[PDB]
Amino acid sequence: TSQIVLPPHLERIRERLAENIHELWVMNKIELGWQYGPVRDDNKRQHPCLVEFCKLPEQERNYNLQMSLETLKTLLALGCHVGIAYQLTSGYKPAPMDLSFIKLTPSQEAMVDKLAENAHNVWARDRIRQRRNPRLVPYTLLDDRTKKSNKDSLREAVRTLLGYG
Numbered sequence: 001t002s003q004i005v006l007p008p009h010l011e012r013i014r015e016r017l018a019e020n021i022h023e024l025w026v027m028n029k030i031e032l033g034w035q036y037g038p039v040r041d042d043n044k045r046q047h048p049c050l051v052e053f054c055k056l057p058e059q060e061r062n063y064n065l066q067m068s069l070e071t072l073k074t075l076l077a078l079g080c081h082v083g084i085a086y087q088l089t090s091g092y093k094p095a096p097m098d099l100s101f102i103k104l105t106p107s108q109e110a111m112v113d114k115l116a117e118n119a120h121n122v123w124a125r126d127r128i129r130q131r132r133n134p135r136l137v138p139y140t141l142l143d144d145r146t147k148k149s150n151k152d153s154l155r156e157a158v159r160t161l162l163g164y165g
Contacts, residue, residue: 023094
């Protein structure tokens with residue numbers, strides 16, 4: 001995917017999708033019950049990466065930035081063209097819009113599936129340096145129950161990509 005130059009015409013859309021991925025990274029943790037704290041812990045149900053997008057520094061935003069970049073690059077490599085077409089938290093308000101109404105076509109369904117496959121491939125290639133976790137096998141030999149978690153993680157990308165026009 002990295003061998004494709006990123007068109008700056010949609011760099012703003014890439015950043016919007018990165019902000020959406022970040023606010024959903026906040027949403028799921030807050031649904032679990034996570035607040036905003038200065039300590040990077042997981043059992044203390046707080047996360048220091050739930051603040052405003054502009055308030056986020058270089059040390060916390062490159063994740064979602066590269067997330068959106070690699071999704072769109074994978075779209076370009078697959079071939080489809082891209083162009084022009086409440087629970088109270090501890091300070092942040094993740095609420096872009098109601099993006100869970102319109103029904104996703106089976107193409108974009110399997111295509112978020114392919115995005116999850118690609119991401120799991122990078123993750124497994126990173127994990128092979130460790131010992132012998134049963135997840136070191138590709139996404140096709142992955143257990144069926146868990147596949148939809150990684151599919152939902154990538155579905156919101158095409159959700160926003162359709163909804164924003």
